């Protein structure tokens, strides 16, 4: 949407928030290995803690964020903990991993699980509540995140060889301007039969439409996320010196996310006219094609296209899911099911799926494992067309 004060407030919020995340999440493994000297096999204990506490905070954030509608109480804590970004990585999390590895991963498990693994979707669900009130499209807001994500990647790559810590300090600063935005943003004020309630939220589990939507999450969405976990190593497996392979990967991510933003700009216009479930199916198809495609790749060119292929599914997955959520279910639960049906249950299945696929990486191998993931992702996207209540592809 065009010039509307409340839109620029939260559009810049996504830009500066995912500018925080772009500094750690993409290229996270390179933080623990090349700089902090954790073994390439030890990192599982850290991801486990981050996964454990995100399991915990996601259902919290979902139920909470819905209880207090657009009150802003939740995002102020997050925006508060984000100010800790710099001192956490530099002086706390880092040296606590040179010390006992276990404890150092707990404080990272709780911190990052809170601010990012669970905090990010809570910010997405909140700004989607602002989406329908102040009259604009959610996709036009979240494309800002793809640009900050990219720009931050551009800055960490430039600064990796000189003063990598510089990017963390930016995070804390961004969090402060993230607070300025949150102050001048206008929504319901504090001091707080059609409202939210736990009883009606647990009765929500009994709804079949939830079960099917969940099936899509763990069947075709979770599988896609574990596929991307170790894609960067598989990406470097087509290049000679790794620091070349990672350099290319850093180009495709930065540029690709710009391509991802552009697509997200128009995504609302498409997702509006072809339905909600169709965006999930289309995303699920782009997903399945990326897995099965990576199973047969044979040239760096072929694998680069497959990475950029990620940039085409994100807009139809994010803009699409909310557009399927807030139509098949009551809006008053929009933030709760998105946090529990998507993030929590996705996070749940990713526990078993991640260790199961990791055994194939050792047993059969990358592309070979990608073939299995591709079949189940493709497979569950098939039954998804019939299960998901809604129009569907036939409606043309």
């Amino acid at each position, epitope marked *: 949407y065009l010039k509307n004060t409340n839109f620029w407030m939260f559009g810049l919020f996504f830009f500066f928030y995912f500018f925080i995340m772009g500094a750690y999440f993409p290229f996270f493994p390179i933080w623990l290995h090349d700089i902090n000297h954790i073994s390439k096999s030890d990192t599982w204990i850290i991801f486990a803690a981050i996964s454990l506490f995100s399991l915990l905070f996601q259902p919290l954030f979902g139920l909470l964020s819905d209880k207090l509608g657009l009150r802003k109480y939740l995002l102020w804590i997050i925006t508060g903990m984000l100010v800790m970004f710099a001192p956490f990585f530099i002086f706390i999390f880092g040296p606590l991993l040179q010390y006992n590895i276990l404890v150092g991963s707990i404080v990272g498990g709780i911190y990052l699980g809170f601010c990012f693994n669970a905090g990010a979707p809570a910010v997405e669900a909140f700004i989607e509540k602002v989406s329908r009130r102040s009259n604009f499209e959610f996709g036009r807001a979240r494309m800002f995140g793809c640009v900050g994500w990219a720009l931050c990647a551009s800055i960490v790559g430039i600064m990796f060889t000189i003063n990598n810590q510089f990017v963390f300090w930016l995070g804390s600063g961004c969090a402060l301007i993230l607070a300025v935005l949150l102050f001048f943003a206008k929504t319901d004020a504090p001091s707080s039969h059609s409202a939210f309630s736990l009883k009606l939220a647990l009765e929500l589990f009994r709804q079949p439409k939830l079960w099917f939507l969940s099936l899509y999450v763990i069947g075709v969405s979770c599988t896609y996320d574990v596929f991307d976990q170790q894609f960067a190593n598989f990406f470097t497996s087509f290049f000679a010196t790794g620091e*070349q392979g990672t350099r290319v990967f850093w180009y495709v991510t930065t540029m690709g996310e710009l391509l991802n933003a552009s697509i997200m700009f128009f995504a609302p216009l498409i997702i509006n006219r072809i339905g909600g479930k169709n965006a999930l199916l289309l995303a699920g198809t782009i997903m399945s094609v990326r897995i099965i495609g990576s199973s047969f790749a044979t040239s760096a060119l072929e694998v680069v296209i497959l990475k950029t292929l990620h940039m085409f599914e994100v807009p139809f997955l994010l803009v699409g899911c909310f557009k399927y959520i807030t139509s098949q279910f009551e809006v008053r639960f929009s933030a709760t099911i998105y946090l529990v049906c998507f993030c929590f249950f996705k996070q749940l299945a990713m526990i078993f799926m991640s260790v199961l696929a990791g055994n194939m990486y050792e047993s059969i191998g990358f592309q070979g494992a990608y073939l299995v993931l591709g079949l189940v992702a493709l497979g569950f996207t098939l039954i998804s067309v019939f299960t998901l209540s809604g129009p569907g592809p036939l409606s043309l």
Partner: nanobody
Amino acid sequence: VQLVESGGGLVQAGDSLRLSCAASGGTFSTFNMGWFRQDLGKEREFVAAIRWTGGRAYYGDSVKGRFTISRDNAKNTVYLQMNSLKPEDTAVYYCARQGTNGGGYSEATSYNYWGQGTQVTVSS
């Protein structure tokens, strides 16, 4: 899964010395293998590497245009053809198998399984 390495020995400058590497354990669907070598003092140097599903093969600079590498699925065996050997080819040639961690095919560190070594000597 281990790595046996056939071939090796003494050859006159100009001969052709075909190396072979088989293994026992698992089918390397996906997995791609390669060869390295080490002389008197040089750190492990790259020579060749090949993956399945495509003749995709990679070769080093000092070796380009003379060594040919091929693979055989099911048989789970890969060979290294050497032609136009010169004395600087003296070394102990290792077999390998790539790892899921690490960065690229040209680096020794990126291969989890190493072979025992098979020395080839070349004199004028």
